[PDB]
Design a protein around this nucleic acid. Sequence first.
DNA 1: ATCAATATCCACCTGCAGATACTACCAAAAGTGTATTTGGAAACTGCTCCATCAAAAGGCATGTTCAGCTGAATCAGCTGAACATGCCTTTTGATGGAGCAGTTTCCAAATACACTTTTGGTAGTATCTGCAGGTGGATATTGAT
DNA 2: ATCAATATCCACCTGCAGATACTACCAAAAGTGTATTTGGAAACTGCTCCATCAAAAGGCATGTTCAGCTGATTCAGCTGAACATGCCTTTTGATGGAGCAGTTTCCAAATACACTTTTGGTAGTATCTGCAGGTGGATATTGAT
Lengths: 97, 97, 95, 95, 106, 106, 82, 87
Amino acid sequence: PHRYRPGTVALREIRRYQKSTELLIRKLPFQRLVREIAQDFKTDLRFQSSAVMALQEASEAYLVALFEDTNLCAIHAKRVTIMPKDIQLARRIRGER
Amino acid sequence: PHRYRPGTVALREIRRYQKSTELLIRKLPFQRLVREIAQDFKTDLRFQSSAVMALQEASEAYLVALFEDTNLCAIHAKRVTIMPKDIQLARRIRGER
Amino acid sequence: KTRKESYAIYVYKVLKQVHPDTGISSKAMSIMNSFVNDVFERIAGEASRLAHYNKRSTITSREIQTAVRLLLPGELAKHAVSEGTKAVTKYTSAK
Amino acid sequence: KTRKESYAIYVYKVLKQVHPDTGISSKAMSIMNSFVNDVFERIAGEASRLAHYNKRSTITSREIQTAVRLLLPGELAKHAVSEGTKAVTKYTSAK
Amino acid sequence: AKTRSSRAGLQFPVGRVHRLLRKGNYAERVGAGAPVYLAAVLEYLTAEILELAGNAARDNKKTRIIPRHLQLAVRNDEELNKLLGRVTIAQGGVLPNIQSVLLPKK
Amino acid sequence: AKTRSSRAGLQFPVGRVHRLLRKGNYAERVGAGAPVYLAAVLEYLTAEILELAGNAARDNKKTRIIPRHLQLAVRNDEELNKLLGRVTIAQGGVLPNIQSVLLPKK
Amino acid sequence: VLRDNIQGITKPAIRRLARRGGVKRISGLIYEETRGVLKVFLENVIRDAVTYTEHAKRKTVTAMDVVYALKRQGRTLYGFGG
Amino acid sequence: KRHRKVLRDNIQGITKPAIRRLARRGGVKRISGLIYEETRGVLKVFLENVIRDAVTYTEHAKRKTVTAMDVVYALKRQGRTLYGFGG
DNA sequence: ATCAATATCCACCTGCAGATACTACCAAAAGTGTATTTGGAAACTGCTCCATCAAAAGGCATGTTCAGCTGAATCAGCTGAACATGCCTTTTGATGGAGCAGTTTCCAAATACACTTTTGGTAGTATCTGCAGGTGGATATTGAT
DNA sequence: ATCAATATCCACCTGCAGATACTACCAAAAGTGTATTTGGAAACTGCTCCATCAAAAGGCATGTTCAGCTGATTCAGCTGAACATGCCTTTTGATGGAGCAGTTTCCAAATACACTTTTGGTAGTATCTGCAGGTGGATATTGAT
Ligand SMILES: [Mn+2]
Ligand SMILES: [Mn+2]
Ligand SMILES: [Mn+2]
Ligand SMILES: [Mn+2]
Ligand SMILES: [Mn+2]
Ligand SMILES: [Mn+2]
Ligand SMILES: [Mn+2]
Ligand SMILES: [Mn+2]
Ligand SMILES: [Mn+2]
Ligand SMILES: [Mn+2]
Ligand SMILES: [Mn+2]
Ligand SMILES: [Mn+2]
Ligand SMILES: [Mn+2]
Ligand SMILES: [Mn+2]
Ligand SMILES: [Mn+2]
């Protein structure tokens, strides 16, 4: 019976996803959300396939960079665990709040 | 002989400066700094005095807003004392890095 | 002895309408003048781009309106849009 | 049908000058084209403002040059300026 | 001869705005409605800020609007604040604000 | 006839750049040298990125530049990174980077 | 088995994003915080793209609409035109 | 012209109390001893960046005098738009 | 809680900097009226490329376990706030003179056509190949003891 | 330490999705040439306001003291990482049709263009006023006890 310690697979994952460039959110659920949010602005919209892709690329680049700032915020408080207050601090300082 | 406790005068100064709008750096020293820096880019420059005042309003608003972000980074660390690591964090998150 | 336009007098007219007994310092007026030019440049710019994106050589009240919706937050956009429509509608019948 | 211009062919040429054995994927070429568009707009943009600030009707290579110094970081600015100056000379001194 | 301003019922100079759009190099052509709509947005916006700033002035027992009043007016208003989110009002200072944890006792 | 690109010594199209400046509403007038100058600047920067992106391709055992290599080229170069500091390269991913304090205690 | 669209942005997916952002350990509360942040991000962008769609009198949101929306939010994207 | 004094170490003209005052306006209650050098360093970067672009506008116009407008445009370029000086 | 130091809050109070008021001018707006050109809206339609859905694929919801991380509690040490004290540096108001900026004159350079040759983009077509995945096997890394 | 499980590295293989070479064509750059307008450098100098300075006005530098903050130490309990797999959501790819985009057309409104009137800016000269900064003197706030 075999067991890797907590954080061991995490590091393995960091290295894996930092090596690659594929999108990390499944496309369909992302698309539905996009259309839902769009429905509040105008009804009966269609979307170029590439348009959703653009939004996904943009949204994933944004969240990945936010997690970097979030992680610096956590580490600044001498933790290794990211918490909502880390996200909050990052966004407040980025000028998004 | 009477003594205010540490913190008390400092809170009094916060209210005092938050209430007013005058520039907080003495004019001449600031003006020399501007001329020193400019001269190192280009010799034999003159300055409209309103040019120097514009740079001073801009720098003072920049520093006050940075100190606010810095305060937030310290408090996030559960301190009340701002430190170089706090400013460095704020500047990193802001994209000045 | 070259002429330098500002929006000062128009800012002053509007001030009298909304606060008939209140004055404005020359520095506050300078800031008001900077704010009007600033917003002007920001709307005209959006309008400029928007036209370029659509292969239009003409900036119309319609480009101005989209620019206003891109540029102003929520409730200011709503009101700016009514104020602008209303002036153009009124303008159209008045010659 | 309608004509869609791109910097692709000219980007391909420069690639062959710089890595004659190296190719480029579509998506990469598409990014490079955006890059060229983006930088053009940024430089032309700044050149436009410079001309306006100085009450001039013309965007000359002097405005392009200053725009370049305003937008590009040090070492990148330096080479761009010389590459630009060099090309305006070669163009002048040739029938 | 009625000004194009009065035709649209505006204080702001429609003539001026039309001209500035041309000199401004924004497009080949300016539509006749454009300076009208723009001048009214401009007037609206300046009414909004003068209203608010006027109130700050009164709240302070002052008769004259100074840069401090414009700053209070802008920063106390969610939408103006965001619209001027990247703007500095000289001689405006900041909003009184002190973080909880900095206060004495408990 | 000899093209202005060839006269200038450039791959990048001086004619197009010239036309694009006129039709882009940047000023009433465009000097004859300006499109030469700008085309050169654009070519230069294209060469600098391609240089570095080609290298990153070589390092990764490949002959075809993909977006990954463009990203690596840009974010490993201090200056290119600053110019593109607010740009997202689709399909670029990130630089391999782990904060030291997260590294397993040896 | 009905489910909110936003919840379609799953924990493992958010975990992956954090991972690429170099995050080692994640609190349970982060997943909801992220979905909220994505929602605000998408609202701001789509609102602007849609506005570009309406201006052009189309019923389809184009890549360019989105590209232009991103450019004006100061989040320039390369790879889809422009 | 005959002689003109040498400008050096003017950064120290940004004194401890001046910095402390700025930190008060920004809501700061307690200041570590090393903040003062850090702040000077940060300010100098800020000034170098704005002065460089301002001076660039100056030279472009062919003046020897840096105008309020030179500064106001440098600020606008860097996304730190300033109202109150003609800009 | 009560006593005493010192900051704070007003209210009124004269100087005055900056704001407001006219009377004159005027160049450049802004308007007006006709002559002349065209941007783009309107309406028709072809064919991408988008929403939909069936069959095929393969990621995630799931509950349990416990490692190791977070936050609470305690506390020595020392850094930073407060304040006293001694006096240097900045602020302020006044003045020759640099350089900005105001007007005018003039041509090298730009815009505008027109007419002539070319090229970049497209589209049909066929032809080619770098490299993502697959495999298989050695070798390294992690965790158990 | 040895050891076994399982991840990771690399060398080689190959099908195919996306790169590429080659032809034919055309509208629209792109260029060359000729007739014409003008933007702005130049050459001069009015005159605003910048560097400079002397005297006046007030903030800064410094050292001593200790209050209380930070950072170190330990610890217990809470909370998120790891775990394996079949249900069920997403992916794939096939197919009608919606709408973007290509083309033609035609006039409401664009620019230009010349005399006609108006008006916003400034400049010269004058009186008026909101409030800054001084004052004393009643009302908190703070910190020792
Ligand atoms: Mn020097
Ligand atoms: Mn119309
Ligand atoms: Mn080479
Ligand atoms: Mn037409
Ligand atoms: Mn406990
Ligand atoms: Mn200790
Ligand atoms: Mn002189
Ligand atoms: Mn060809
Ligand atoms: Mn492989
Ligand atoms: Mn002229
Ligand atoms: Mn002493
Ligand atoms: Mn335990
Ligand atoms: Mn149809
Ligand atoms: Mn008048
Ligand atoms: Mn007072």
